[PDB]
Every structure is written in structure tokens, then in C-alpha cells.
Amino acid sequence: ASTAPLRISFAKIKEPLEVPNLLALQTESFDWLLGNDAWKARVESALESGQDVPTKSG
């Protein structure tokens, strides 16, 4: 975020997409397994944006 320490960067072009969560691949999958509230939030959010989502928990 904006609170990260100072580091001077030489980047000459701006990436419009930031790196997603580096542990989403596991936590999201296991949320789908248990089908807990985070997975339901993800499901409804994806449906609102018209994505492809697993509607049935594990």
C-alpha cells in the first residue's frame, strides 16, 4: 500500500494491474471446499460482474 518503505524505482512504464494475492490459489480453493461466507461473497460478486464461478461448494 502507500505505507510501504521508500524504494527508488527505475521503471519507465506503468503496469495497470497490480500483482494479485500471492496465496489466492490456495485460500480461495479451500473457501470453495468448505463453501464458507467468503466463497459465497466471491460467488455473488462474480455473478454481479458476469464472470464464470463455481456455484456449488465442494
Partner 1 sequence: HKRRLNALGPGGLSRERAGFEVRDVHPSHYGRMCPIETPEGPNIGLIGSLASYGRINPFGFIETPYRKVVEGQVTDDVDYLTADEEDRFVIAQANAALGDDMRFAEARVLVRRRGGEVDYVPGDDVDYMDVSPRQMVSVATAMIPFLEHDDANRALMGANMMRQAVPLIKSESPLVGTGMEYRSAADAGDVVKAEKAGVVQEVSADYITTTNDDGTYITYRLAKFSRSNQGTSVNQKVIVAEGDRIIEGQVLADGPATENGEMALGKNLLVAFMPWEGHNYEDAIILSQRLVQDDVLSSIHIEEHEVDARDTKLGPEEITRDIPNVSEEVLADLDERGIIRIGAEVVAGDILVGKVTPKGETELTPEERLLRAIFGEKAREVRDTSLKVPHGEIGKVIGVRVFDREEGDELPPGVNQLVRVYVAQKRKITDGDKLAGRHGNKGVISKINPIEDMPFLEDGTPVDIILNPLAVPSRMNPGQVLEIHLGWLASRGWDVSGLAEEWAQRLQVIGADKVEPGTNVATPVFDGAREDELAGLLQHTIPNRDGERMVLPSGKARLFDGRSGEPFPEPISVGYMYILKLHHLVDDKLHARSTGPYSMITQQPLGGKAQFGGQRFGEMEVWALEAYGAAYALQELLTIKSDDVTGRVKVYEAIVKGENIPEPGIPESFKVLIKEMQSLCLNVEVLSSDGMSIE
The residues binding partner 1 (CB under 8 A) are: 1, 3-13, 15-17, 19-26, 29, 52-54
What span, in angstroms and rounded, lies between the C-alpha atoms of 46 and 9?
35
Of 36 and 54, CB closest to partner 1: 54
3-state secondary structure (DSSP) of residue 25: helix
| Closest distance of CB 22 from partner 1, Å | 4
Q: Which three cell numbers stand for residue 26?
A: 490456495
Q: How far is the CB of 41 from partner 1 (least distance, A)?
A: 17
Specify the residue, 7 or 36, whose C-beta has the smaller distance to partner 1. 7
Query: What count of Cα atoms within 13 Å lies in the side-chain half-sphere of residue 10?
Result: 0
